[PDB]
Enzyme design. Sequence first.
Site, short mmCIF file in Angstrom:
data_model
loop_
_atom_site.label_atom_id
_atom_site.label_comp_id
_atom_site.label_asym_id
_atom_site.label_seq_id
_atom_site.Cartn_x
_atom_site.Cartn_y
_atom_site.Cartn_z
N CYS A 229 0.77 -1.22 0.00
CA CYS A 229 0.00 0.00 0.00
C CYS A 229 0.81 1.29 0.00
O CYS A 229 1.80 1.42 0.71
CB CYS A 229 -0.96 -0.03 1.17
N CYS B 39 -0.87 3.99 3.13
CA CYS B 39 -1.24 3.39 4.41
C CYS B 39 -0.36 3.81 5.59
O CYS B 39 -0.87 4.14 6.67
CB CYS B 39 -1.28 1.87 4.31
#
Lengths: 105, 105, 105, 105
Positions: free
Chosen positions: B29, B32
Amino acid sequence: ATMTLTDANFQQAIQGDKPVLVDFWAAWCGPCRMMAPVLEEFAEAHADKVTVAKLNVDENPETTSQFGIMSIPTLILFKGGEPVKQLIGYQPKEQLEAQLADVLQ
Amino acid sequence: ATMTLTDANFQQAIQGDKPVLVDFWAAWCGPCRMMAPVLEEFAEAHADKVTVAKLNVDENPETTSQFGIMSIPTLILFKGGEPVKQLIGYQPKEQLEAQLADVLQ
Amino acid sequence: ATMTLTDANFQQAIQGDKPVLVDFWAAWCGPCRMMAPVLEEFAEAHADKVTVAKLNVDENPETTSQFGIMSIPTLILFKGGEPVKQLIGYQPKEQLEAQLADVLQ
Amino acid sequence: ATMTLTDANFQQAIQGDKPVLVDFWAAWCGPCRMMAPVLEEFAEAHADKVTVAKLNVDENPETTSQFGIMSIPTLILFKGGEPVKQLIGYQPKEQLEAQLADVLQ
Ligand SMILES: C[As](C)(=O)[O-]
Ligand SMILES: C[As](C)(=O)[O-]
Ligand SMILES: [Zn+2]
Ligand SMILES: [Zn+2]
Ligand SMILES: [Zn+2]
Ligand SMILES: [Zn+2]
Ligand SMILES: [Zn+2]
């Protein structure tokens, strides 16, 4: 069979009693064209469960910005006036069926 | 201050007392890490109206599949045992607040 | 008809003059499953113009983060070791033909 | 110093002498405003090696469609007369540097 939404009538549309599936598209988006017929037919077969709408991003920057659109096509399913699903990219009929299985129950 | 959910306990978790804001994330990600602190502070400031939890899509495909997750990260607020709102991508403090103000009352 | 790439062999796989189309997918991605067969027929029919490969994002976070993947399915066409195209979402056979028109010659 | 490209002068710009980096954007784009000063400065620091330009997709649907734009923003670096690299989404200056500087000589 798709309802046409605008920055001006957007809020009204999603405060309705039936979930609303909004197609964020543009004329420059090749995949959107190919998808239109599939969405139109999807709309015709489930108008009893969901309202399928279309929003021209080229003419409605406010709503498009509000929901953080990043790529075109993008379909957002609204329930209770809130976005509960965001489908990214081309959506074959089989996926529309599978993704909205809940609202179509 | 961030409960970890898995396919095994997920169902029970969304059937708890307070609404649960689930952050579906992945090791690859982008935003994140940049979001971790934001979610911690959010949880700290809304302890009484929500429970913030995380689900690693890399290790929990069933729940990830069931909820039609495609973007990482994806935040889904569960209330009534079902998704009431979903947010994708990086969500800064103020945006999280503005977006959730209406599903937490 | 589709080679499997990993964080360990990825660079070598894209270090050539022949274009490589890399499907970034995940176990939890329904659409991806529906597209595997479309990608397979495509690979077979254009092996002379492009190499088609798959990278499982759950197991290969390095390459996935490197290219900034945000949503799943994402296909990236590589030419001369550089990404020249990022196709977001499900790609019907016709979209793959259209989008990769250049390399198909 | 970035050029404004249009469907009218697009081919004329990308077809010549040095490389051309085109920023495909839209009024509703999230990170585009933030990226403007970044693109300008990167352009200035590499002015001998590349010409940086912007193309509004709404106003210029033809070029947008021809290059299969899906994400906004999309940066495409043109060399000779074809794309040699593409980046999607927000990019800070150091990422434009890491991603494009080497390909520009
Ligand atoms: C040419 As320079 C200042 O980006 O190293
Ligand atoms: C970092 As450089 C290739 O502009 O000297
Ligand atoms: Zn149907
Ligand atoms: Zn609050
Ligand atoms: Zn072909
Ligand atoms: Zn430099
Ligand atoms: Zn230097």
